[PDB]
Each structure stands twice: as structure tokens, then as C-alpha cells.
Amino acid sequence: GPGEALALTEAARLFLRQERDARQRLVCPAAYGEPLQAAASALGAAVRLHLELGQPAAAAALCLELAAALRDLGQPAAAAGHFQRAAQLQLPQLPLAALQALGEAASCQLLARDYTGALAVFTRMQRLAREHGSPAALGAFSDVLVRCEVSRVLLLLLLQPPPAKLLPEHAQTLEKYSWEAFSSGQLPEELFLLLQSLVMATHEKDTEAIKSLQVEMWPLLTAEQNHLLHLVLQETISPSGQGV
Amino acid sequence: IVRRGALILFCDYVCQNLHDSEHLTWLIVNHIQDLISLSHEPPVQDFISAVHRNSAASGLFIQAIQSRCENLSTPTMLKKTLQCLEGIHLSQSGAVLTLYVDRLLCTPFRVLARMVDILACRRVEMLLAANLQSSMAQLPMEELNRIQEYLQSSGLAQRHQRLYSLLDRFRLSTMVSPDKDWYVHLVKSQCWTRSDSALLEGAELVNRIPAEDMNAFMMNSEFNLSLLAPCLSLGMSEISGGQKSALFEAAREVTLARVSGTVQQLPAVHHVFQPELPAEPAAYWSKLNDLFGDAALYQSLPTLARALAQYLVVVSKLPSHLHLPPEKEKDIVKFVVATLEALSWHLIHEQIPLSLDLQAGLDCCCLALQLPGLWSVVSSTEFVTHACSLIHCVHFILEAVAVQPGEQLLSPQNPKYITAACEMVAEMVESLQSVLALGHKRNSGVPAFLTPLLRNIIISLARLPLVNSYTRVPPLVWKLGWSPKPGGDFGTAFPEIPVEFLQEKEVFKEFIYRINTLGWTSRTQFEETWATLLGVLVRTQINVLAVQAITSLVLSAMTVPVAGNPAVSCLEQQPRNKPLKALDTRFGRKLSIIRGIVEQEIQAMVSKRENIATHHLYQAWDPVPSLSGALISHEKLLLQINPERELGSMSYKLGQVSIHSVWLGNSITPKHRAGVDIHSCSQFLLELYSRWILPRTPAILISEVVRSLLVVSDLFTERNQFELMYVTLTELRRVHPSEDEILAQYLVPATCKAAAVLGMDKAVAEPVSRLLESTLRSSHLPSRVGALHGILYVLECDLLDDTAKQLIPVISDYLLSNLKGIAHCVNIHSQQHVLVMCATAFYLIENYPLDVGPEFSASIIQMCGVMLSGSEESTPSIIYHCALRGLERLLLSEQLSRLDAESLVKLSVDRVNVHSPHRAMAALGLMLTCMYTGKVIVAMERVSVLFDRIRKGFPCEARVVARILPQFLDDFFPPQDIMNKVIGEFLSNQQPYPQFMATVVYKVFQTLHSTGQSSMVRDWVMLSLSNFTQRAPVAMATWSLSCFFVSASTSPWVAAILPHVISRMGKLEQVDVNLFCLVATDFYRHQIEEELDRRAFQSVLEVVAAPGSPYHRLLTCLRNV
Amino acid sequence: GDWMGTIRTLTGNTFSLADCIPLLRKTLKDESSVTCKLACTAVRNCVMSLCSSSYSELGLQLIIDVLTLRNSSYWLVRTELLETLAEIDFRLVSFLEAKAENLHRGAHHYTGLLKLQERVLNNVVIHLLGDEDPRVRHVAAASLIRLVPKLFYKCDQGQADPVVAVARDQSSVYLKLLMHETRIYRGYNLLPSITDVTMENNLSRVIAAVSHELITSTTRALTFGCCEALCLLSTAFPVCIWSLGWHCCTVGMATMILTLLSSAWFPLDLSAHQDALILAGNLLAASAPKSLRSEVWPALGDRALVPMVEQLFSHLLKVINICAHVLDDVAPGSLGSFYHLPSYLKLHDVLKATHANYKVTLDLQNSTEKFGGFLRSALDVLSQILELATLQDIGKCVEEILGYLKSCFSREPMMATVCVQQLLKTLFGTNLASQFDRPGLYHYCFMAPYTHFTQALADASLHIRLFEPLVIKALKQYTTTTCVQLQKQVLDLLAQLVQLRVNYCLLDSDQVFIGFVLKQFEYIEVGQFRESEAIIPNIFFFLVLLSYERYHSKQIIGIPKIIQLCDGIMASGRKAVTHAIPALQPIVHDLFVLRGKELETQKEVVVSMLL
Questions:
Q1: B420 contact C CB<8A
Q2: How many alpha carbons fall within 13 Å on the CB side of residue B165?
Q3: Which of residues 134-153 of A touch B (CB under 8 A)?
Q4: Torsion angles phi and psi, residue B574, rounded to 5
Q5: Which of A49, B74, B616, C257 has the largest CB neighbor count within 10 A?
Q6: Cβ of B626: how many Cβ atoms within 10 Å?
Q7: b/e sequence A150-171, b meaning 16+ C-beta within 10 Å
Q8: CA atoms of A198 and C51, how far apart (whole Å)
Q9: What angle do CA B435, B440, B443 make, to 5 degrees?
Q10: What is the DSSP string of A85-111?
């Protein structure tokens, strides 16, 4: 029963150790990686056993193990897939665990440079945090909300979706960073003011202001969000799609 | 707490004792900043409100803010200051406006500039509403003029135009020819600035300046150096196309000249940069505080480094005379070092430098350490201090970005800077596993645009002779009792680790990591590590490790560029599919262009950039040598690379080398590597393996040796080597019975590869079908995947059995049975299995369309059609792009009967309508191939879906569709059927990107003048009765009219100013009106001609009279003609 | 400044207090772990005083310096570091960080911020929850509990900036309002429970971090430590009171912990197993006044919880059965049956080993004993869960539960008695589920305390046959034991039996028990009862209850005799606080509130002794 699940997960863990050794620990530019497939098969069997026993949380934990291993080995997209698998397995009993898994999936999508996928996961996270986080979120959900908000603003400034294809969620967020009258939300005042200035500077095509804001916002953002802001500045100065 | 609470209490006391004003005056004048900081507190709120109800108190408030705005510059402090100034008493509407415009308007924080705009706008509205005798009193005569003069001298009247208009209202109440030199002056009006606003457009502009005076234009002290990297980039696109670019050559001379110029300002003797405190060593540091210490020069080093990196990233693919000369190389090296030092200097004095400047410096370092001319310089002994400064600055930047105070980078003669650099390079090399592993638990402090740069720089620096010998030693060996005496023309050459210090598994693992990460810098080092690994081999699990290290080391020789440099090189690939014959024709040569564009964009969007270090987008290249060898350009391998490896993935796959390349390069009718005798290693491993697996060898080592053989056979050169391989593997099949567990995975594909290389016959290579069929029926997939890889090896060019053809249905039924299940579910299944299955199926359909026919090659199209249409979650992106590219090769290859071919051309319409832009771009490529291969209203549907992609796509996808549209239009059907649509798409309101459609219209109009349609263009232009001049954004109306008349012009120098017009899509300044009048007049005189048409033109303007300026000034110009 | 100036005038030496901080820093980087632990102790002694001083930058530097000690290959350094970091006020550290500008760079000119609170909370305290030494894990959990109240988070609606948080901490002590003013189990709270929103946010973030480390735990030790920490938090911040901080009530973390309990290695670690049982019971109890109805477990209504409650109930019965087999030494071979389950058979092996080791030792003051602690915790959670049971759930189960208690009573008689009391509550239907039917620095410093003060000043002008052998065993153990907590619990059980209207002649036919209880008063008054302070209130409650009772309608004890016992305790002996006052409380309550003419003179006597 559960002892077979234990045997399987502890086999998969050693398999993942061996793949990490053969690939990263001792770099081998001659291996495509066999123990990763063995670990994937073992983890899948363990997940299915746990789902049969009525334990979606243990199966989601195994999916998280596999996803972290996949992201380690330089496979961000498959990692994001498995992270979202775990988040769905956890969702209607552990919203916070699912929000953590979805944040991992969004980080993995940003690693894979899948910016629309990361934007979609960030919006799903903000939605779920608003539904389960209670204006005045609980505080464990307020962290998720702050991260998803900053990341969504940065990703919408990077992508710049056209007004035609622009969801009501995206527009409702973007209009919040336009200013007309004396509001920060779950965001600290300084960061929120810098984000409003960033939105208004990328809209009015002010490169010098964007550079000043890039330097000012560096300590306030995570390195993931510093990457997003660097991409915004670079897409402003050197747009993608021109071929030169 | 006491300070703030006591101020709050005193404010609440003054709120109530308001009759006396000395405490109020004292509070204001002495604690204005505390009042503003605490303004959210109700007593302070009430105090500020009471200040607002007192003209003298409000004046004291403003006088105190004017003397304290220094610290009210912080975004929060300034927002609070504005919240306080908002309700200021009306009797001070002249003072607070003065403060607004003099101090608070020009803030780098744009939201506060907007707040100030609104509040000042209201202050003038109030001055206007209040009567005259007071409005003139608060705002004096010359004060209003000085406010307007500050707004106009600065560019502030243009960002805040409503404020300028309100001030104008208040004062009112209170009392050329389009020739070469005009174009040159107009360009100079935009490129002799210092602005990063329109770099691409400015590059397209300076490109048209004549070649005879282009190098003298980019070399003045006014030319924006921010343009050099675009000008190179654009210039590259005209050398990549095949022509000669004067833009690229001029920008290159200017870039190298400016690099030499700024290097000249460096001190003569160079000292190592050390961040501790560079003041003690010499007065050198005074000069380097004056050099890149100001901004006039520091703000030119990364701007020059961006240009230098743009140049250095393409010198690997340039004509020979466009490589950098040997005289500049030292220059360049010094520049690179200096740039990094500048960055490190900025880090020490003024916080993070700039995401762009950092990237530019690290790009220059990365790229310079990859060029041989520059490596050989910085690797020498005269440049030891420069290499030491490189190591010091890289370590410094990595710690300043990634290590918090209180943490360490790694978390569990002989000047001291030599030892420091050795230990720092070793530490950074160990950091490549955790801190600089993209997607590792410890890469979260690094922003991921520095991680590939830092990995590549660190490998390159760890290969320097100054630190290489030290770095190759594991630290677990320093923990033991090993310390010899080094000396190597530097003082740091260490003897390699003795094998007694390698018998432990941990030290050996660390040493293997070192040698695999760093590679080998020469044949000598390769031979040293070869002898070391052999002497380790000659114990529990050390043999597996040694065999894997040996095969890694020999695969290191396969990398086509810089023999064994991981930073520069990747494993050479020889794809099994061949160059398609549908191209190299008339319509195939146009599909080549239109699809190469989409391919560049798909590469920029989905490719894992494993062989690419810097950020530069259009850097894709494949490790495929000509073999007829230089590397084959990426645009000649359009649909050639093996369909089962991910886009941009460069690791080792079963199938790296095609059997055709075996039979061709080393002619084996069915010497050594780059500088290293790989034939001797080939024979040595062949003998040692053919004498190790047949005679108590444990299975866990049999598997590893067969794996190593399967890998190394990519290096075999002669037929007898493959013969020995096959005989050994057959005798091993006989010796080792059905018990494999892990042997079939490598036994079956090694057997099949060797059998295929030997011109497969029914003589000895007959019984491969038996174990092939036996292997497709297994319990674990790895063996079946190796079986499919062997199937591909054997299907390449080897007539199966030379008699019996049962193998093709044996394969095809496995394919058709195992693929059909994986279409409603692809994530739960293995990616590698699906990819090799589709690769097999596509190779069968293309090279064996005789045995396949009813069930295969038609249901496979169904597998792919149901995979391509799966949800973005259900179908991963690597499987999507594999299936799409395989379908595109099946389509472009004519090996299909025309009921699955057509069943494919109709598979493309559903896939452009997806949200994910990279899947959309892949679908667009598939659609373009369906169009160009199978070649009226269907083409109209296609052009309409193209315009819809422009209309509802992200700016990248839209820009790409707009770049490919003109060719597509003038390729598939005549201009009269589209010159309506395209114009309607440039003249619309739902169009999010008129600036792309402007270039589309321009290209269509200028391509009209091909066969003699230089008159249809003025006819379609005169069709501006209703469409044009009816555009509620009058600014957008005159902009689109100017763009349309630029596009519709037969005169040079006026058709060349379109990027100057597209650069200002709004911006209805007066120079824009003058440009519109000049351009419309140049269309009036030269084009119209018919005197009655002149009047049909003139009486289309005054319908929208607009006597202000957009059309009245034009009507005046036409009257002057 | 002034103190050092005075002392430098008097003595003459130019010693600066800013010269032992460099020595502490150097001593922390020492080669020896003994010296390292001693320097950590010195930092613990001085760091919070330094941060509150004009040398606060040096205190922040010392906090930065001690962080590297979490890697020590010596447990006592790690525990000293944990105890040092638990003393730090992170509202003050946040204030100092917000003021610092060149200290965020530290050495090597770091770009970015110190983020000391996040580093201390996640890289040290929660990281050392994964330590392989159980002692370090326990210290880390204790330090987490101490840290929760003083961890300033930004954009909190209670404290906008850290200055306001510090001001709150100061004002809550000295400006504490000078005012004043049917037995549910420890886990339930049928009240609004108005909690502090700032502490709610802190507890929410801490629980989220610990639950994340528990869900993604790839290590046995990390799982054990996170479970112990979450159990500690549910003790110090009860899920019933702090319902918002525990997510929600709690459907998810309860099923997560229950999955842990259905693992294959986790229940074999006795300490982590009992921590998990306590946590799961607490979480399932915190859902009472939102998930109760006024089928199986019919009083629940919220049916997402019924499977969790059923699973926990059956598991508790199985492990109490295992403990009963280990105590009544019987090898394994109808609801707590475990003979046909391998995981519970392995648990039986473990508990049998622990108890066989216990059977051959004589350490009666050993409190941390594993088998006794496990049985105590399991009985505790059974008693907590029984509050939600109605008779339908338990009426066909009570027989085997009582059989188990009869054998586990010899080992843990206090908790066996508690569980018998809960079973009597559920039988007679007296348990729960049967008886169920902007502000900153001016608000906190002056306005809210003054408003409370003036408002107070202005308002200042207005199936029983199955319980017989366990009850008999409890009474005999009372007559023979010296454990005061067991005697307190037996008196609670007897009081409950009397209030349930169970006849006293049924239990005390010879009046032997009250004979012994009154004979105890001799030693209580003489001062020869070792801990009588614990037993006296319960004795007097029981006697007051027995005064209402009728021995064949002839008074059993009587209020006058109780009053004489009380005044004999009072006028003869020592402190009235521990002895006389707690004896007068039951009499005062059950005489003035709950109560023709001799009652008046009894009240007169009580008022006289109160005076």
C-alpha cells in the first residue's frame, strides 16, 4: 500500500541523485540522461498509487519533486508543466501550496522565455489569491498578490498587448497605474510609485526615465523582476521582431 | 518615536490655539519636512488644513518648501509634498506655481511629474478664474515670462502642453527641396543628438547617407554613439543577404577608431584593479578617479562596448577583410578590461551601474575571450595584469550582485593578486554548479540575464594559463596534503594531480567536473588528461567514472569550432535529412527569404540558446560543417537539422552524425580531429573495449562500455573500426543473454549503427531486423527508443536485408499504433519517445513512400494535426515545433500523393489563431510553406488572416508579419487586389500598429515601380476623398498623409525619410507640419501633372478646412506653386 | 556619551565602548567552536541593547555577523545562534534597516538590501528545522514561536512603518488599560475571539513558510521539524483563536497532516507522530463554531470534514489499541483493530521496544519518556475529538474505548480520566455539538489609550454501567496516589458524575472517599501535603456539589462543615493566596450566585471571613 509508494519515491529520489551527478555535479558532455526517465517513471507510478489511495497532496509533492529536478537539469518548460500539475492536484484543499507551485511554474516559464504563459500563470495566481486571501489580504496571500502584481505589470509592459487582445484583468491592472487624482494597494508606496512612473514612461517613450527607474528599482525587486525590468528596457531600446 | 509624537502633539495644540501664529510660524519654518512626512496623522492633517486657510501661513509653507525640496525629492516625500501643496490658499497661486515649475516639474519619476502637471494646471485655471487685479499681483510681469521661458528652453512645454496653453491663455488675458543635403541635414537633426529613442529608425536613416561621406558623418563629436550598434546590426543584414554594406564598414571603422581613442586616455602602465581600497598603491588611482569617474566619459564606455559587442558577435561570419586587424587587438583587449573596471568603479562609488551597461561590459568580455586574436593577447605574459583585473572585476560584480552581506558565494615574486586571481577563478568555477546554474535553488539572486554571460566568461577565464593549472586541481586535494612548487612563466603552473590522489570517488568526481567544464586548452593538455584518465582506469565504481570521463574527453574533440573550448564550441551535428530540392528554384528561392525571416524569429523566441552566450537575438548557428570544412550558415540548414532535438539544443543525441557523413567525409564505400590524434584514441578504446566486455566483467560496466562505444563511434574513421565494433557487439549478444536491464538501450543502437555503416548486407548485417523487432516489444521504453534510433540509422541509406522488406511495415505498425494513442495526452508521456517516433515517421514518408501508402503517410498527418491543435498545456512546445517542422519538410519535399499533401495545406488555417505568439509564428511558417509550395479567394483568406495577425498580435509578431507581408503580396496576386486592403489597414482606427503598416504601404508602393506602375500609385493616392482626411486624431491624420506621400514618391531623398516620419507618430509639432507641406508639395509638382487633377487634389483638402495649420498651410503652398 | 565622559574624567582611560564590538566580531570568526559559542552568547547578551542605542549600526553588524554560525558542525553553536536570534526585535531591526544606507552594501559593495528578517526567518530558523539533531530542531521551533510576535511586515493595516510598530510595543505595556472584567476541551473556542490583525498576518506568513517547507520536504528531519514547529504554533497560537492566521478553520492543512500520519516512516518516529496527532486534532477542533449542525458524525454538517474526523478517530483508536496491547502484553493476531495492517504492526513493534526499554529502568521523574508521552498525546487528541461526537458515532464504539482505557489507565491515569470524562460528556449529551444551537503613532501613543481611559471614566458612574470499573479504579488510585494532578482530575470526574445526577451511594457506599478527602485536610492544614494548592479548589467544588446531594434525603456533608473546613485552612497555616482564597472561591460562587433563612447566616459568615 503506502509502503510501496515509499519504496517507489525512495527509488526515484536516488535516480534523481544519479541524474544530477551524471549531468550537473560532475558535468558530462556525453550523457543525455537515463536516470531522469527512470525517476520520471517511478514518480509517475508513485503519484498514481497515491491518487488511488486518496492522497492528492502526496502525489502533488512527488510532482513537485520531479518539477524541481527538471528545472535543475535545464528543462524549464517540462518543469513548469509538472509544477502546474502539482498546483492543480493541491488546489481545492491547499490554495497556498498551489500558489507556491504556480509561482514555481511562472518562474520556470520565465526561464523558458514563455512570457505569455508566465503572464497567464501570474493572473491565475492573483485570481486565486484574491478568492482565498480573505482589499486587506491575509498576509500569506498578500505576498503572492504583491509578487503577481509587480510581475504582471512588468510582463504587460514587456509584451504590450494590443487594445484588441487585452483581457479585462490586464486592463483593470494597467489602468490602476495611470494617475489622475490623489491607491497603492498591497504594494509599498515607493515601489508602487516607481511602477506607476515606469508604466507612464514606457507609454510616453521616455528612455532616460526608464533607465533612471531601472536603477532606482533594482534594490526593491527580486532578481526575477529585475530581469523582467531589464527586458522591458531592452525591448524599449531594441525591439524584437525587426531582424536587425 | 518621541520626535514624531511630540511634533504631532504640538500640531494638535496649534490647531486649537490658532489665534496666535508664532507657534504655527515656528512649526512651519523649522519642521516643514516633518510636517510633510507626518501629514497622514490627523492632528498634522488638521494643522495643514489650518495652514491652507491662512494666506500668510500658506506663504510660509511655500517659502519653507522652496528651501527644503532637496530632501522632498524622494518619490514618497514628493508625493506627500504635492498632497500638501494641493489645497494651498488661493492667495498663493502664483508662489506654488512658481515652485511647481522651477523645482518639482522635471522629476525623473513620471507619475509625480503628472501630479505636478495636474496641480499646476489647476493653479493657472484658478489664476484665470480669479479676477485680473489679483492674478496680475500674484504672477508678476517677468515671472510669467520666466516660467514660459523655463518651459520652452527645457523640453518641458512639450511633455506638458496643456500647462503651456493655460499659461498662454493667462498672459493673453493679462496683456525646401528634397535633395541630398536636405536629407543629410534632416538626418543630422535626429542622429547628431544624444538619445536612445529611435535607434533602429536612425540607423535606417544614416544608412541612406551616401557612402562617400558616411564615415565622416558617424565620426563627429555629435554623432550619437548609441547608433553604432544598430548601424552595425542593420549593416550585418546587408552582408548576410550577400551584398556589400557601406553602413557596416563605416560603423566598423568608427567603432574601432573610438575604441582606440578611449584606450588612448588610459594610463600607460596598467595596475590590477582591486576593490578593497585603490588609493594606497599609486597615483594611478587618482587618474582612474578622474577618467571614468565623471560622466562625460563613463557614459561612453558601455555605449562603445555595445557597439564593440555587436561587432565581435558577427566577426565569426564576416568576409575576411572585415575581421578586426591585428593592430587593434591589444587596443580592444585593454578597452574590454577598462570597461569592466569602469563598471566595477561605478559599483564602488554609485550603486548598480545599469542593466544595459553591465550587459555591454560583460558582453565585450565574453566575446573577446572567444576570439583567438584577442584570447592569445590577454592570455600572454605582457597582459597578466589585465587578465588579473578581468578576474577581479568579474568576481567583484558577481559578489556585488549575488552575495548578500553576511553570506558567502559558495555555501556548504608571486604578487598577492596572482594567488587572489587563482583562488577567485577556482571559486567562480565551483559556483557554476549552484550560484550560476540557471534554474538552480541558488540562482535566485542572479537576474538571469547575467547568468549565461557569467558562466561563459568564467569558463573562458578559467582556461587562462595564469589560473588554468590551479583551477584543474580539486579543492578536496588542497584539503589533503598536496602542495608542490609551481612556476610557469607566471608562477602558478601546477603539475597535474597524481593518480594516487584520484582513487577516491569524491576527488575523481571533482576532477572530472573540472576537466569537462573547462575543456582542454591545447593538444598537450588533452594528452595529459588522457593519460591521467587511463592511469586511473588501469576501484569499486572508479571504472565507470573513468570510462564516462574518457568518452566525454574524446567527444570534446568532436566539437567543430575551437577544438575543445566549451565556451565557444558545441558537439558537431550532421543531420540525416538532406537539403531539399524544392528550394534552389524560382518560387523556392523566394520562400527561402520569406521563411528565413519567420525562422529567425522562431529561433529568437523558442530556441534554447545553449551555443549562444550573449543576449543578441539573431545569433542562431548550428554546429554543422560543410564537409565538402567550414560551418554551414544557419540559413542553408532551413529544415535540415534532425527533427527530434529541441530547437537550439546542442547536447549529445543518438544520431549526431548521419551515416552519409560517415561514408562521405571519411570515404567508406558502403586523419585525426582538430589538432589531436583522435584516431589513436579511437583504436585504443576499440581494442581495450573489444578485450574487456567479452572476458567477470560486471554488467554495470558492460553497459557503460557499450554506451561509451555507441558514443565514440562518432569518431571512428575507417571501415575496420566499425567492423570490429559490430563483431564485438554481436559476440556480446551471444555471450550476454536476455538479461540486460540497461544493455539493450545501448547494445541495439550501437549494433544497428555499426551494421548500417558497413553498407548493410544480408551477409553478416542481416540479423539486425531480428533484435530490432525483439526490441520494439519491451517493458521499459528506453530500449524501444534506442531501437527507434537504430531503426533510423538502418533506414538512412541501407536497403533493408537487400531482399526482404518486412522491416518497413514492422516499423510503421509500431509507429501507427503508438502515436495514435498520444494525441489526447502528451504530457503524461515521454517527450523523447514521441520525438523519435515522429522523426522515424517523417523519414519513412520522405525516403520510403513506396512501402508506405494506405495506412501510413496519411494517418501520420492526422497524428500531427491532432498534436498541433492540442491545448497549449496538453501539447508541449518542443513537440509542437517538432511536429510542425517535420510536417513542413514533408510538405516542401514532393514525396506525397496529393490527398495527404492537400490534407496538410488545410491543416495550417486553425493554428495561426492561437494566443501563444511562438506557436502562432510556427503556424505562420507552416502556412507560408503551404502557400509557396502549392503554387483565388483562398489567397484572399490568407492575406486577411495575415492582416488579422497584425491587428491582434503582440508587437513582435505584428512586426514580423508586417516585414514579410510586402513580399507575400507582390508574390501571390496583383497589387490592385490589395492596394485597397493594405491602404484600408493603414487608414483605420482598430489598427494598433500604423507604424508597421506604414512600411508595408511604402514597400508596396515602391515595388509598384517595377514593371511600370509609377502611375497606378498616384491614382490610388488620389483615392483619398473619404478615407484620408477623415481621422479624428488630426495629428494621426496628417501623420498618415505624410507617410502616404513619402511612400508614394518617385523622388529620392524624400522616399528615404520614412523612418524619420515613422519616428514621430503623434507629435504634431511645427517641423512636422513643414515636412508634411514639403512632402505633399513634392507629390504635387512632380507626380500629379494633370492641371485638372491638381484641382481634384486641391478640392479634397479644403473639405476639412482646418484653417489652424495641418491643411491650410498646405493649401497655401499649392497656391504658391 | 555623558556616562563615558564622566567615567573618562574620573578614571582617565580613553576606552571606548566601540572597541569590544570589533573583538566580538573577531571572536565569532574564531577557529574554535567553544570560543564561537561563547562569542555567540556575548552577542546574545548585548545585541538588543546595542540596537536600542546610539551604536545601533554595530548591533546590526553583529546580527549580520552571527548569521554564518548556522553552518557550524557543532550543535551547541547552532542552538546558541537560534536563542540569540529569538531575542532580536525585528521591528527595531526594520527601523534600522530602513535608516541604513551604506550598511546594506556591507563589504564588497552589495547592490540590494540586507533583508535580515527574511534571512533570519527562512535561512536560519526554518532552515534549522531541517537539522539532523532533534535538540537543534526543538530550539528552532521555540525560537520561531518567540519570533512570531515581533516580525514587522510591510503594508500592514495595524502598523504602516516600523516606528509605529515599536511605538505599539512600548505603549501596550505602560498604557495598558487599568481595568478588570459546560467545560469545553482545550481546543475549542465558541466566541468571536477578536484577534490582533498584525499578529494574524505574522502568524499567517510564518505558517505559510513552515507548511511550504513541510510540503516540499525531501528530508525526514525537515518533515519532523516542521511538524513539531506547527504543533508548537498550534499550542502557542491556538487555531481556534487565531483562525485567520491558520489559513481558512482548516480543511487543507488538516488533510495534509493526516496524509503525513498515513505515511510509512512518519508514524514510526514517536515524537513527530504525537506532534502530528496534536496538530491534526487542534486543526479539526478549530472548526467548531462555523461547521456544526444544531449518517455518520451528524453534528458536523460541513461534510468535507467528516472523512478527516473519521480517519483521525479510527487512527487514534488503533494506536490506543496498540498501546493497550503493549501495556497488557499481548501479541497482535472491531473499529480500532490493527492486526491486518502492516504499518500499524510496525508501530506496534516500535512502541513495544520503547515500553520494554521503559520496563527495566527506574527514572520516575523522566518526563520526556516516549511511550508515555505518545499514549498521553493520543488520549489527549481522542478526548479533544470526542467533543464533536454525538451518541450515534460513539454509542456503538464506547465499549472498546472503555476496554482500552481500562488497560491504559495504569500508565497514564490522568489522561485516561480526562478521556473517561469526555466519554461521559458524549454519553449524557453534554459536550459541544450536543449543547450547540491608518492607525499610527497618534492612535497608539495618545488617542486610543486616552479614549479608552475617558470611556471607562464616563461609564464609571452607572450505558453508565460500562463506566463503573474505570470510576472505581480512579477512586482507588485517588486513595493511594501522591500525584496531585491525578487527584485533581479524579475530583473533576466525581464533580461531573454528581452534576450528571449519578447517585453518590452508588460510588461511595461506605463514605470512604469523602472520609479520605476530609482526612487529607489534616495534612493540608499542617502544611505536610506536598502540592495542596493544586488540589484545594477542586476539593471544595466537590464538597459544595455534595452539599446539595441527598444521602437518602439526609445531608451528606453540609455547607456549615465546608465553611468550617475553609476557615480551618485559613486561620491555621500559610498563604491565603494559594490555600484560603482558592477555597473561598467555590463557596462564594456556589453560595451567592447559585443560591431559606440559614442561607443568610451562612452568607454572613462567608462575608465576615472575606472581610
A1: no
A2: 5
A3: none
A4: -130, 100
A5: C257
A6: 10
A7: bbbbbbbbbbbbbeeebeeebe
A8: 36
A9: 40
A10: HHHHHHTTT-HHHHHHHHHHHHHHHHH
User: Quick check: B954 and A31 CB within 8 A?
Assistant: no
Q: What span, in angstroms and rounded, lies between the C-alpha atoms of B449 and C173?
A: 51
Of B200, B444, B954, the CB nearest to A242: B200
Reading the block at residue B902, the C-alpha cell is 492537400
The number of CA neighbours under 13 Å toward the Cβ of C550 is 3
Q: In angstroms, what CA-CA distances link B656 with B170, B573, B576, B631, B792?
A: 77, 5, 9, 15, 12
Distance between CA atoms of residues B675 and B565, nearest Å: 13
In angstroms, rounded to a whole number, what is the distance separating the alpha carbons of residues C36 and C19?
Answer: 19
Closest CB from A5, A58, A143 relative to C205: A143
* DSSP-derived secondary structure for B225-285: GGGHHHHHHHHHHHHTTTS--HHHHHHHHHHHHHHHHHHHTS-SS-----SS-TTSS-THH
Burial group, residue C600, by CB count within 10 angstroms (0-12, 13-18, 19+): exposed
Question: Which residue in the block uniquely carries the three cell numbers 480526562?
Answer: C418
- Which one, of C302, C209, C293, C214, lies nearest residue C247 by Cα? C209
Q: Does A117 sit within 8 Å of B872, measured CB to CB? A: yes
Q: Are B960 and B603 in contact (CB under 8 A)?
A: no
- Contact of A93 with chain C, judged by CB distance below 8 Å, is answered with yes
- Helix C197-215 with C252-261: angle, nearest 10 deg: 40
Experimental method: cryo-EM
Resolution of the structure, angstroms: 2.6
Shortest Cα–Cα distance, A154 to chain C (Å) = 19
**What DSSP state is assigned to residue C550?**
B
The CA–CA distances, whole Å, from B214 to B231, B254, B389 equal: 11, 10, 37
- Choose among B516, B828, B956: nearest Cβ to A241: B956
Whether residue B359 and residue A230 make contact (CB cut-off 8 A), yes or no, is: yes
Please give the grid coordinates belonging to residue C321: 489499541
C215 to chain A, minimum CA–CA distance in Å? 6
Which set of grid coordinates corresponds to residue C538?
A: 477542586
Distance CA B804, CA B806 (A): 6
What length is written for chain B? Answer: 1121
Show the 3-state SS of B167-181.
HHHHHHHHCCCCCHH
Distance CA B340, CA B559 (A): 30
Neighbours of A189 (CB within 10 A): 16
Cell of C64: 549580520
User: Which helix (H) or strand (E) covers residue C359, if one does?
Assistant: none
**Cα separation of B1044 and B1041, whole Å?**
5
| Residue with the three cell numbers 491624420 | B1037
Q: Which residue type is seen at B878?
A: I
C-beta atoms of B951 and A164 within 8 A: yes
d(CA B199, CA B190): 10
The candidate with the shortest Cα–Cα distance to C337, out of C317, C307, C309, is: C317
CB-CB contact of B248 with B238 (8 Å): yes
* Nearest residue to A53 via CA among A14, A3, A117: A3
Question: Are A227 and B517 inside 8 Å of each other by CB?
Answer: no
Is the CB of B737 inside 8 Å of chain C's CB atoms?
Answer: no
Gap from B161 CA to chain C (nearest CA, Å): 37
Cell reading at C370: 516516549
Residues of chain A found within 8 Å of residue C112, distances taken between Cβ atoms: 218-219
Unique residue bearing C-alpha cell 492633517: B45
d(CA C590, CA B10): 55
Q: C103: buried, middle or exposed (CB in 10 Å: 19+, 13-18, 0-12)?
A: middle
Residue with grid cell 517659502, as numbered in its chain: B63
C-alpha cell at C73: 558542525
